[PDB]
Every structure is written in structure tokens, then in C-alpha cells.
């Protein structure tokens, strides 16, 4: 038995230094990277505040007490550590739902979400996710023996009064991990389905204007649904529809039909997405930049429509749509597709560590609702302490990802 004290001692401390220095790692790659200074990274901010508090203080709080046999700190610390724990873990849950939905939102409302997202914005969000987890779970843990006016947890265990019925152990693994990720399974199937393609004139007019899967109201308050048109998953034939429509309209126009014969198709597909845009006649209505276009004065065209309300309402569209005439390439919707793809990614990533990590407990949660005490405290052990992994595991799928956040760790462990 001691030969198994020390072996999980110090693997456990091993593994506690590891999750320490890796969260310290981001934390400091973070300060000493402006680059890395995103509204997505803020997110990640939060998860290793999360993760650093369950490496320093909940792996060691656990340890001792598994090694010791018993709890020897008092009932005060152990409803502290407890709250601690449950608090930290449950706001990680909430800073990766957050994070699926940001992703998501960013990739299917250019308009109402993506143009709109600043730190602050982030900073609400993650506060909320931390006040939420903590208002929920440390009264619980440190009052539900004052609710039920005695407290039945034994002087030598350090356990959660009322999850001890399997009932209720069941709900709380529905409403705080299967239905969690549930949804961040399937905000990321949607964030996955629109990775997959390659540049062409769907992705630019989806990067411009985002797909909704049900019908909302525009920003004139009209009905339009998926691709500014005006509920399905297939909205592909649709799409080809209007574009079919709009080059239809475009070629029976007096004054966009020359220049439309005379631009290469890329800038075809720049002036489909400004009909998408505006429309036909609004279109018409740039006759001096759609005749500088026609003579392939790309530099002279592109002045010319930096200089216009188009490129004031929207600036990031315009943008892209000038580039695209003045290069002829796609390089300006090319950049966006692989930032998203990068984003996607790294996702992928903290979403797999989550699910992987946190599944074995909650398995065992559900098999102890479908029996009577069957899974030993053995297992209930290994499964706690897995999920605490998860924290030691997440800078490394930083590491793992994201190019940005590898240079910057290679740069600080060599000291550069
Ligand atoms: C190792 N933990 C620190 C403790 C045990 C695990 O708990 C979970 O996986 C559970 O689904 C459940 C515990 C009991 C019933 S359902 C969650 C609890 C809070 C959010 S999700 C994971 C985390 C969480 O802080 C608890
Ligand atoms: C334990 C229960 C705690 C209950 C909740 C109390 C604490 C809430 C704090 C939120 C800070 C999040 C706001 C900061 C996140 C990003 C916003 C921002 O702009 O931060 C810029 C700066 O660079 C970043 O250090
Ligand atoms: C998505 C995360 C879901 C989190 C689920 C939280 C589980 C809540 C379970 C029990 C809380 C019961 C109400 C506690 C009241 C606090 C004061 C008291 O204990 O009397
Ligand atoms: C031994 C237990 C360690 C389990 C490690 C789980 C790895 C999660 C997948 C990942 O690396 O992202």
C-alpha cells in the first residue's frame, strides 16, 4: 500500500506541474503576444483561469484525500474545495458553450453577431458563465444541509449531500453535461459542414451573408431566410436559384451586361455578390466605376468605389469585393476561410479533450441510475481524477492547433 501511496503521489504531482506550467504557458503567451490579443482567445483565457485553479489547488485537495483514506481538514474545508471544484468545472462547461456558440454565431451572422463581437462583449459572456456556475453550485454544496436541517455527510467522507440519490445524480448529468454536449456537438457539426468546401462563389456570398437554417427578420424587418433570400439544412439548390436569377438579370441590363461579358469570372462573381447586395439597379447605378471596370482600370475602378455609401454601410464586404476586382483573385475570401478553418479546429480540439476526459463519470452516473451501487468507489476515483485531466490536457491542444500560440510556447520555453 505505501509503494501505491508514493506511485500515485507522484504521478499525480507530475501531472498537477505539468497542468500548472501549461496554463501559466497561455496565460504568458497571452500577455507577451499581441497577436494572440483576440476575442476568441479571451474565451481561452477564462478555460485556463479554470484549469490553473483545478491544477494548483482541486488535483492535490483530491489526492491527499484518496491517499489519506479519509478527510482530515474539516467539514468547512471540505464544502470549500467541493464548491471550488464543482464552481470551476461547471464554468468550464459554460466557457465551452459559449465558445460554440460564438464560433457559430461568428460563422452564420456576419451582420447582427460577427461585426458586433469585442472583448467586452466576450468579458460579459465569460463573467456571466463564472456568476452562473458559482451561484448555482456553491450555495447548493454549502447550504443544502441548512435546507434540509441536518447534515447527513459522514465526519470522515467529503461527499455532496444531495447527489448521493441516483435521481438526482441523473438529472444533474443531463441538464450539466449530456445536454451541454449535445449542444456544442451539433453548433460544431454546423461549424465542421462549413469548413469542408473550397473557395468558390457560395463560400464569398456566405462569408458576406451568413446561412440561416430559419426564417428571421432582416435588417429592413423583412422575412428572409438562408442566404438573404426572401426551414431546411439543402439551401445549395436555392442559392444556385438566385445566382442563376441574378446572372439571368444582370445579362437583361443595359448597363451591367458589357461589363459583365468583359470581367474575368471572378469579378463576374464580385458583381453577382453586389447585385445579391443591392440589386440590379443599384448596381446600375455605379455607371462611372462599372465603365472603369470594363476598360480594366482595376486600381482606378477600386479608388473610385472606396468612395461611395456601399463602402461606408459595410466596410469589411466592400472591402473584399474591391479587392476581388482590383486582384481578381480570391485571396481576400480565402483569408477568411482559412481563419475560420483554423478556428474550427482548435474547437475540435478542447471539445474532444472535454467529451473524452469527462465521459467515463458520467457513464457511471447513468449505469449507477440503471442499477443499485454497482460502480465501486474504485471507479467513481478513476473518473474524477480524468476529468480533472482535462484541464492538464487543454494547453496542450492549444499547443497542438494553434500555429500563434506554438510559436509563442516554443519562444518562451527556449527563452527567445
Ligand atoms: C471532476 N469534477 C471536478 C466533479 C465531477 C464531474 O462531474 C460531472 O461530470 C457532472 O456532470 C456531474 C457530477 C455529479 C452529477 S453530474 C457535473 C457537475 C458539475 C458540472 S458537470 C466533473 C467535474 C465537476 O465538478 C464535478
Ligand atoms: C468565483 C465567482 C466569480 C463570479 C464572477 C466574478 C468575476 C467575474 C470576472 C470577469 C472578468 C471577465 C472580463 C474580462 C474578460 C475580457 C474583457 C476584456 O476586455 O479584458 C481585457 C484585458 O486584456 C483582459 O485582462
Ligand atoms: C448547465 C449547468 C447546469 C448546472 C446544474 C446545477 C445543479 C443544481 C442542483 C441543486 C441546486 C438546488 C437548489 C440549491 C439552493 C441553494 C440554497 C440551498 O441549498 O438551500
Ligand atoms: C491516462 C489518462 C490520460 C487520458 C488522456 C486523454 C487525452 C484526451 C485527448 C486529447 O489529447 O485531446
Known sequence: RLWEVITIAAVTAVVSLITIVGNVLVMISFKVNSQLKTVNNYYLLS????????????????????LMGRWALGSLACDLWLALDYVASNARVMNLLVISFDRYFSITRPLTYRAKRTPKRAGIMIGLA?????????????????????????????????LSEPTITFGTAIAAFYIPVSVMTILYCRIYRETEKRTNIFEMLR???????????????????????????????LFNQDVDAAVRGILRNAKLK??????????????????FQMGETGVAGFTNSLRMLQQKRWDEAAVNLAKSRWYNQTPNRAKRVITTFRTGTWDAYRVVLVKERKAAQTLSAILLAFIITWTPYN????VSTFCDKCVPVTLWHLGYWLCYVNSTVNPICYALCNRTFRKTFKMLLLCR
Not at 478555460?47 to 484518496?66: E, P
Not at 453550485?137 to 447550504?143: D, N, T, V
Not at 459583365?260 to 462573381?269: E, H, K, M, N, T
Open 47 to 66: 478555460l485556463a483561469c479554470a484549469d490553473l485553479i483545478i491544477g494548483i489547488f482541486s488535483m492535490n485537495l483530491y489526492t491527499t484525500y484518496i
Open 130 to 162: 463564472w456568476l452562473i456556475s458559482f451561484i448555482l453550485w456553491a450555495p447548493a454544496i454549502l447550504c443544502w444541509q441548512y435546507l434540509v436541517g441536518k447534515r447527513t455527510v459522514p465526519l470522515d467522507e467529503c461527499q455532496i449531500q444531495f
Open 207 to 237: 462569408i458576406d451573408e451568413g446561412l440561416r437554417l430559419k426564417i428571421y427578420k432582416d435588417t429592413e424587418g423583412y422575412y428572409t431566410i438562408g442566404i438573404g433570400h426572401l426551414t431546411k439544412d439543402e439551401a445549395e439548390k
Open 258 to 275: 458589357p461589363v459583365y461579358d468583359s470581367l474575368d469570372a471572378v469579378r463576374r462573381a464580385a458583381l453577382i455578390n453586389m447585385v
Open 363 to 366: 457513464i457511471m452516473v447513468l
